[PDB]
């Protein structure tokens, strides 16, 4: 099985799972620890922001690849803003501070 780009889920902006659903590989927790074990800071940054979740990042990246410019414009993951709204939907005021 292989996936470059196709459909994703509803709640989250990450790719679907499985083969019958044309989906990508779950880059799990211990693989993130293995990339932290190296100096792979940029590989991990595209591994969890551009390739997976951030919608503006992935559309800009697809257009940047097909122009011939391997460069990522990262932004913030969508599932973290989902986390902010689920935490904030309690009586909890979680924010994002100064520039």
């Amino acid at each position: 099985h292989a996936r470059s780009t196709g459909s994703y889920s509803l709640v989250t902006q990450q790719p679907l799972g499985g083969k019958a659903q044309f989906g990508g590989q779950r880059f799990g927790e211990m693989e993130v620890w293995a990339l932290e074990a190296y100096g792979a800071a940029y590989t991990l940054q595209e591994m969890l922001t551009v390739k997976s979740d951030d919608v503006n990042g992935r559309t800009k990246m697809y257009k940047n690849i097909v122009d011939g410019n391997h460069q990522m414009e990262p932004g913030m993951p969508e599932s973290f803003n989902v986390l902010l709204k689920e935490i904030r939907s309690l009586g909890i005021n979680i924010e994002l501070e100064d520039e």
Partner: protein
Amino acid sequence: EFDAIKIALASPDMIRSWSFGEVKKPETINYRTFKPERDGLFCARIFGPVKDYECLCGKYKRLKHRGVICEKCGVEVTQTKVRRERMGHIELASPTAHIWFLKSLPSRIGLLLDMPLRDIERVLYFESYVVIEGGMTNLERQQILTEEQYLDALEEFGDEFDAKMGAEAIQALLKSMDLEQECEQLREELNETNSETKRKKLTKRIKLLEAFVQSGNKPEWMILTVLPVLPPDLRPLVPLDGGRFATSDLNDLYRRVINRNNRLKRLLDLAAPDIIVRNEKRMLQEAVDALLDNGRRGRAITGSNKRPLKSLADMIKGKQGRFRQNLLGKRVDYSGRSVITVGPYLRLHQCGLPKKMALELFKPFIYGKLELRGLATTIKAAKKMVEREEAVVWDILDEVIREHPVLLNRAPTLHRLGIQAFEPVLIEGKAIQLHPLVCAAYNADFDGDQMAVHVPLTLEAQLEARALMMSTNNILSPANGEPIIVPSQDVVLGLYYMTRDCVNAKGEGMVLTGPKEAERLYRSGLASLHARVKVRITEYEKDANGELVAKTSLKDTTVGRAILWMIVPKGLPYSIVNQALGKKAISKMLNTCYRILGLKPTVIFADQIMYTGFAYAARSGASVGIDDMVIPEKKHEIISEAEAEVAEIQEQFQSGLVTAGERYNKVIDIWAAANDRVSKAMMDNLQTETVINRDGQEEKQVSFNSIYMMADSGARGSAAQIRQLAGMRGLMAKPDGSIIETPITANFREGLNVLQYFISTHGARKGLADTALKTANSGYLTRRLVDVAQDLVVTEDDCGTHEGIMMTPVIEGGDVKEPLRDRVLGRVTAEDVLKPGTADILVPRNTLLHEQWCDLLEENSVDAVKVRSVVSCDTDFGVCAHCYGRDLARGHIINKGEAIGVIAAQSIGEPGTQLTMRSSIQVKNKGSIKLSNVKSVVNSSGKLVITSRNTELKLIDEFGRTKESYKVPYGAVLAKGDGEQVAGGETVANWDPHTMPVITEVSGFVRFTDMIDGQTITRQTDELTGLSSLVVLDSAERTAGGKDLRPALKIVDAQGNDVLIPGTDMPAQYFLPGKAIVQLEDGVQISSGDTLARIPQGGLPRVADLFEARRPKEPAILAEISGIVSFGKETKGKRRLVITPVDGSDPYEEMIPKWRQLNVFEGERVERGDVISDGPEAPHDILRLRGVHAVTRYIVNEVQDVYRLQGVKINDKHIEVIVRQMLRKATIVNAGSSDFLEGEQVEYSRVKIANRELEANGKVGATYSRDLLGITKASLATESFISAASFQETTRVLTEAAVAGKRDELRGLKENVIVGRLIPAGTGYAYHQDRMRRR
């Protein structure tokens, strides 16, 4: 873009500021059409239009007026994702307190209003009343009231009196709670009391009272008044395949809260009576509490069928919340997965990758390449071209592959060598071809395994895959110094068959002018691959400074050793191939090649090793047959001699001469002896079976048996497995844990019958159950370790210290187990090591000890090295580059940046699978004696007896290093003395552990002081001997009239005056303990070394209990202060022990549980770190008593003992840094001139920078005290709540952070993996240097 994440409470004004419209109706959707509800949960005006830039109902179907809201639609006009960020709010009719601040353990409202949880819930569920500023009545403010208590009060205090209930009353209490006022009171209460329990109970209440005043969190924000609703997009309502909507659980929760709130508003309209609106508000309280955190209240609500439905807190917490399932691990585009296979033609920087996966993973690069050439125009055309797969896109694909690495990943990645980057080579096929040597890194066999491929998209990621994660760059395991590209199984058989010899072959003893014609004689058919031969080889030894000097000579060698010499690079000597080359020898061949010639010859030489091993293993034809497993001819007579022996033992058992346990022990002993004899018979019969003549009489050699080369080469097989295929397969054990007395005398070449196979299945089912349940604890151990580490980044170059732990070789009592060169390899010395002669600067004080320095250490026989350890590093927030050590997979020091906490945690937890889950001293060598911790005396006979319990007996050799060590008890008969030379095997120690010696220092006469027969001691004349002994009783058997009497022996002179201790003016009286029996009676003159009484008496969960720092059930008790010791009160729960120091203050004591067999007498002076009883010892006692270096030596020795018992090589840096992360918190003792509190627990770097910026001023600092937290308590007690929330319980940590108003200055690895940016360790450390500089 943004610094720290701030968490605080949500005010009702803040919740109305989040909101965009009140969600009234609970009606979800229409359900018969497609439209929602106006205005229900899924509204239009409150949130937004379903369709993008459209009024859902009807107006604006173009792009001109985005925003207009007509009365017929009551709809906003924006994007489809606008509803995902917009949230609604439910105006709760009746106030409802939060469940996270009422049941968090400890509750936030429980230790703030000074009221028990039980009483808080009673009033909260409309079952109890609470008073609130009554007035001039006889009632308190916190005191509650019941129906009867209120009824009577109602008729009594009908006027000025307030007694409400529920959240409303609670809210008022919190609202009317002067925070500041309580502070002073609490502070004054803590300074006006001495109660230990109260002190801790008051310090925990004042801590959460002053923390609330420090932030902008109000006391009335605990109760929920304006409940917030999560965005619809985040609670999606999609239908499955069919005609119904599979609705989420949160819609059930919100719809019930809104149904109940509408009912409660209608009842407060209608003026229903009291009990109706109490049940109505109570059902609303339980509905809100079920929405927020379901199931924390009594049994959780359920929709379909009996399974409870999932609430908001269950969208956060757990293994499947947002942290562990969508933020730490994500699903990933440009990724693939398939079954692996070998492909041995590869070079070790490249892997095979199928054409179909390659054309799917590289669709955008192919699109960009196709658009560059000009073959097509629009993007559609290119997608049709690769959907059709024409003849021109495969050249495009070979031009996008070429220099573009991919990340191969095996699915259980345990350490960092399980993600490696290759270059693709395209494969006709559907299976990833993976280079074989690399398999030993992935733990990948080829029995059905699968791997995932990931594509580095951007340019920095291609460079990170080539420069950090390439497979040529990972040739040493980061856990140690051992190479991980060791040749595994076929190739060592090909080498072991190639470089060997036989006593006659084709071309025996002919002479050859080079290795080239050695291979030419092997190929043409004129010699054999193993035929001993003088060749002329030219080995290049590089003895100058970087210059290779040729020396050519004639080596008496074989043909195969010359053929393998054609592949060895220049610098290695010929003697690396002159031996037989098993697996350990080829591993040290690649290791010496890496240490001498560097990286590139070692990569190309690893490939040439693998190619020549595969080729000559193919030419070998090394099969396995049924005749290869040679049965010993002596096996049947050994079994019959064992059968005669068990027959003799059972004939004694019929006549009852021996006991049953001694029978079972004798049967297990003779079957162990017969098993060892059968193994030696088959091992001789395999290791030297070949006996071939050469030009005359016969001559023997090691065998070319196939199973023996598979065992001796170390390819696959050991002694035990080849033992079970030929000799008997031992004594298998039943699942009771005890062994079975009748062994399995049949191997596998003979047939096992039925019972023997069933006993075998006992033994093997236990092993499969152990692995399949062991793996969960191994993985959870790696998780706890990488979440306690998680932060620690090499961030300096020198901390500027002179402290470091004292690396000695470790010695258990056998031969010296782990040499000093294994422990001080590549670790930077603390002070400069003196050469063992006299005062020489052998090595300087900041040199890395690589192999050349360690060889000059081994030549001089250096005792022990004071070396720098990670736990002694002075760097605030990180570890400096010298106190870590060598890079371990790079030859140099650790770079500024490389995350060492994560590689250390992986290197400790990765061998978690291989670990298991469930008289006197006899010297061995011949050397010199030395004693430490010794205070001794010469007895009458001459044997130096010892008056100290804790004496260490070292055996030092003639060179200076310490070769043996032992522990000698109080009062043992030493055959030798101090500084003496002995012989190998001579007994040097003797004692009796069943009889605790009460030996003396001086001589004289014996008097019975406080020894009265009848109450103190008893008369027990011996039965079978007649020589009686006055038996000393204990303090429990005698009655209360004489229980105060302490029996003792004090030595006098010939007159009767007390003979004093030499050095003091005190007599030497020995107080006899309980259960003693007097050996030497009254009037008998004594000497030293003679007793005065007879006193009769682990694998992987050990690693968990060392890092998590549990206490053992019966710890060894110690002394918190030095000085004289005494006893106390007679058995009220415990038996007291009072320690009065010589110069220090007296009042320390401890109540010992009296079930322990003590070690100390009444006239004994103790010390800190000195034992009082025996058994295991808790690490907190080591930390608060001996020192920090003592507890780090304790953990690294007690866990390298597990990792060495199971045989795993791990360097000690990793355990020292997880020990650093254990003892990172501290507690204050004297607050000093700072802003801390008395017994406040604060982290160590904070208090050290505080009193280091105050001590640089005039003010003297604050004196701390370090504390050792276990790894899950230490990773949950962090100054970064996302780090402590991605890990275990999120409810406790988020309420603690919310009511404290905590802020997360990100500054670690997992905060930046959550929030989606660069890691502040690796390549991103320059980015975080830049961002930290530009503030």
